[PDB]
Amino acid sequence: MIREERLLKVLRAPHVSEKASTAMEKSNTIVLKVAKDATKAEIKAAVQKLFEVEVEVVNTLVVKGKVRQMTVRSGGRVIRTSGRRSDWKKAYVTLKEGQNL
Amino acid sequence: MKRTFQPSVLKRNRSHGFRARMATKNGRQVLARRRAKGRARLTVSK
Amino acid sequence: AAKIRRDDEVIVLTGKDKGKRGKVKNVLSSGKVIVEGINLVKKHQKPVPALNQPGGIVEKEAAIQVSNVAIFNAATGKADRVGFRFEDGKKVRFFKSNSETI
Amino acid sequence: KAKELREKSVEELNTELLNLLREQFNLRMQAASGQLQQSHLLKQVRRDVARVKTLLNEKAG
Amino acid sequence: SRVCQVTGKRPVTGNNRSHALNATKRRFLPNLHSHRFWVESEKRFVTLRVSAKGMRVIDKKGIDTVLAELRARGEKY
Amino acid sequence: ELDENLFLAARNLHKVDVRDATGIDPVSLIAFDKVVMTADAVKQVEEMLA
RNA sequence: UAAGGUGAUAUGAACCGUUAUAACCGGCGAUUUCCGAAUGGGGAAACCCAGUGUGUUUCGACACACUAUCAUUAACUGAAUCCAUAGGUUAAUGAGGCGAACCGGGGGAACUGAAACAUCUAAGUACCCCGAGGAAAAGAAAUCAACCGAGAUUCCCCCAGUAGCGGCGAGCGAACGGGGAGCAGCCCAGAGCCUGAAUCAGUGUGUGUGUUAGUGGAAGCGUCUGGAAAGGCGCGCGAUACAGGGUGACAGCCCCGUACACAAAAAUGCACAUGCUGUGAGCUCGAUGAGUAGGGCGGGACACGUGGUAUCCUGUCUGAAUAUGGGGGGACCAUCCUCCAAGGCUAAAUACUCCUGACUGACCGAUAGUGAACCAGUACCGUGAGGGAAAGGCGAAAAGAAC
């Protein structure tokens, strides 16, 4: 069985978008950001425990980060820097009949 | 016309990859030289 | 081991404000201080409605070098140098010209 | 903080750790949802958790 | 490799010299042979790769002494 | 002789040099405006220079 | 150690702190994902898949530990085959990989020079490979010398571009002896008598001295020019401190320092002094390193190219004497001189600098100095090995231009 500390780790944030809002209002589906190494069983247990709702099924995907470019000044001189935003995991959690936040 | 570079990731890794460099002592010497130079990318492995 | 703290009455030694006195407001880590109403500059404040307002031209204290100010004795009425000594196992500052603790 | 934490026992330290982890999760949800004007609480709870399990690891021999 | 297990003789390098004294690198090889030696004490045959010089040494010292020497050096037979 | 009292008192004066009559060198004799020698130093310098 | 802080970007936000448990600095701990020798198996580095135990469970499952190979040792069991070996399983200990030069060893060029070129040179150099240490190697005369004597190795200066070697060409190039740095010699091949008999390594305490944070440090004002004074002028003061750096122009006395004098909970280096642990002392009798020295054949090393060729090493074939014996003294013999091979160990003087601290420079100053003063082994180029840049300066202060 999954320990409670793991469950308190795996849930990162609710994900806000019009796709997420439409999913909630159509299919009773909750979209979250989760830890990149969280399995579907872990997400199911975490939602069922920390949110006190009953979960039907979890769908997950990994989002690759984009390249972001911005400048940093280093000793009276602006230099252009480039780097990639970190990947993250998105969970589509379908609720049986409960209401969430 | 067909040009010389005809990419293929599998062939690239099997020829010049990290595990291919580590398999022989000459390839291990290639890696040591690149570490001594301070190369940001040791191999084609990505 | 600083010789200049916050509520120190200092006197400016150099730089178009000689003889003016004021309290130290901040001690910057770069060896500079903000002294109340001495090193005044006119800032052309750009408008930012998010937090500030139209801006206008404002007057602020600019930082001045710590080497450019001296602790004010207020007993001799002159600038003074400050040394360190131990009293009851506590480091204290004293005026060098007077040997009195600050 | 480490003093009265050291006064507690292993089982009390585990209860404290669990409470801190729940508090951390609640703060994370608040921060994500746009609440939590007091951003400084995140670092506070993070350092409290580190302290608690430092004490826990030093109790176990 | 081409090493005698008793004396340790191994290939050495030298020069081929012609009548005009042209020097080309060459190799001198030991006179290596594989021989089954009868060990009276152990009632068995031990096979060693030995040079003819090593075989003379075994004749002089006896097989048990040289086997003890090989064990001391850690050589496997 | 080398007097440590004299040596220490002259360190911080930059146009004064105290020497040992065996540490004299050609440049320092020309460089300074005046050269002061004690009589013992004079005899020692004679001995060195024969 | 502290009145300031939450690294740069950085403004802000939300906060922490003000004798003391904010921050910062040092010692010792804790945590330390994944890959990588990578080691449970695999693999196209940073990923895929397990087995066995222990524990937990809400029966969905979860957590933790172990499981590479080789070497050595031990236990168990165990083929042909009777005993037995080989083999197998399991334990314990060790190794493995990386790293700049210096060091020892195994292999080892060519260009070039010879005004061509093959002997010769370049050169045992470049390079490849193995192994180690803080140094390594060598080292205690089967050495020289010369009828007198020295007394182990190593390194420096001479001897000396000498004697010699040499298609006697190009070129290579010593020793003897002298001056210095440094300087201890020991053990086994063996028994008795005495017997831990100091010795040398390891460990534990004590002292001393360093290292890893720190503390105190001593003295200047007026006036002129000026945006600003540290400059000019005037009058003072410190100095075991006038090294250096900063501050609105050039400061001994404004600041940080400097001379000088102090400092350590803790961890450590080096010296000593002790406690214990193995160690062995001293004496008398002995013994004195054999497929070895030497030889024939082929090579190599010696300054020495086979030459009249001493000496050393050995791939191959042989092969002594063994202390009234043996080696060497530049073919060889005789005298007489000197030494004792075929077993080992051994500090210092010597070589180097990936790295740390301090200091110095008739060294550079942005096309220079490192390729790189700058977010450079980067951008970019190449399948890859690999190649490889250009790019510093507002101002004292952003006061960096409200309207």
From Swiss-Prot, chain B:
GO biological process: cytoplasmic translation
GO molecular function (one): structural constituent of ribosome
One GO cellular component, as annotated: cytoplasm
Keywords annotated in UniProt: Ribonucleoprotein, Ribosomal protein
Tagged with keyword ATP-binding: no
Signal peptide bounds: none
Matches recorded under Pfam families: Ribosomal_L34
Family: Belongs to the bacterial ribosomal protein bL34 family.
Oligomer status and interactors: Part of the 50S ribosomal subunit.
Protein name as annotated: Large ribosomal subunit protein bL34
Organism annotation: Escherichia coli (strain K12)
Swiss-Prot record, chain C:
Domain of life: Bacteria
GO biological process: cytoplasmic translation; ribosomal large subunit assembly; translation
GO cellular component: cytoplasm; cytosol; cytosolic large ribosomal subunit
PROSITE patterns, A to Z: RIBOSOMAL_L24
Keywords for the protein's UniProt record, in alphabetical order: Ribonucleoprotein, Ribosomal protein, RNA-binding, rRNA-binding
InterPro entries: KOW, Rib_uL2_dom2, Ribosomal_uL24, Ribosomal_uL24_CS, Ribosomal_uL24_KOW, Translation_prot_SH3-like_sf
Keyword Zinc recorded: no
CDD domains assigned to the protein according to its UniProt record, in alphabetical order: KOW_RPL26
GO molecular function per UniProt: large ribosomal subunit rRNA binding; structural constituent of ribosome
The protein's assembly and partners: Part of the 50S ribosomal subunit. Might contact the SecYEG translocation complex when it is docked with the ribosome.
PANTHER family (alphabetical): MITOCHONDRIAL RIBOSOMAL PROTEIN L24
Function: One of two assembly initiator proteins, it binds directly to the 5'-end of the 23S rRNA, where it nucleates assembly of the 50S subunit. It is not thought to be involved in the functions of the mature 50S subunit in vitro. One of the proteins that surrounds the polypeptide exit tunnel on the outside of the subunit.
HAMAP family attached to this UniProt entry: Ribosomal_uL24_B
Family: Belongs to the universal ribosomal protein uL24 family.
NCBIfam families with a match to the protein in the record: rplX_bact
Protein name: Large ribosomal subunit protein uL24
Encoding gene, per UniProt annotation: rplX
From Swiss-Prot, chain D:
MF (Gene Ontology): rRNA binding; structural constituent of ribosome
GO biological process, one term: cytoplasmic translation
Alphabetical UniProt keywords: Ribonucleoprotein, Ribosomal protein, RNA-binding, rRNA-binding
One annotated Gene Ontology cellular component of this protein: cytosolic large ribosomal subunit
UniProt xrefs under Pfam families: Ribosomal_L29 (PF00831)
Domain of life of the organism encoding this protein: Bacteria
Consequences of knocking out this gene: Cells missing both S17 and L29 grow very slowly and have a rather unstable temperature-sensitive phenotype.
Family from the record: Belongs to the universal ribosomal protein uL29 family.
Annotated HAMAP family: Ribosomal_uL29
Subunit field text: Part of the 50s ribosomal subunit. Contacts protein L23, trigger factor and protein nascent chains. Might also contact SecE and probably does contact SecG when the SecYEG translocation complex is docked with the ribosome.
Function of the molecule: Binds 23S rRNA. It is not essential for growth. One of the proteins that surrounds the polypeptide exit tunnel on the outside of the subunit. Contacts trigger factor.
Name used for this protein in its record: Large ribosomal subunit protein uL29
The species this protein was found in: Escherichia coli (strain K12)
Gene name for this UniProt entry: rpmC
UniProtKB/Swiss-Prot annotation, chain F:
Domain of life: Bacteria
Disulfide bonds: none
Record's miscellaneous remark: The erythromycin sensitive allele is dominant over the resistant allele.
Function: One of the primary rRNA binding proteins, this protein initially binds near the 5'-end of the 23S rRNA. It is important during the early stages of 50S assembly. It makes multiple contacts with different domains of the 23S rRNA in the assembled 50S subunit and ribosome. Protein uL4 is a both a transcriptional repressor and a translational repressor protein; these two functions are independent of each other. It regulates transcription of the S10 operon (to which uL4 belongs) by causing premature termination of transcription within the S10 leader; termination absolutely requires the NusA protein. uL4 controls the translation of the S10 operon by binding to its mRNA. The regions of uL4 that control regulation (residues 131-210) are different from those required for ribosome assembly (residues 89-103).
Subunit structure: Part of the 50S ribosomal subunit. In TnaC-stalled ribosomes forms part of the binding pocket for L-Trp with the leader peptide and uL22.
Family statement: Belongs to the universal ribosomal protein uL4 family.
The protein, known as: Large ribosomal subunit protein uL4
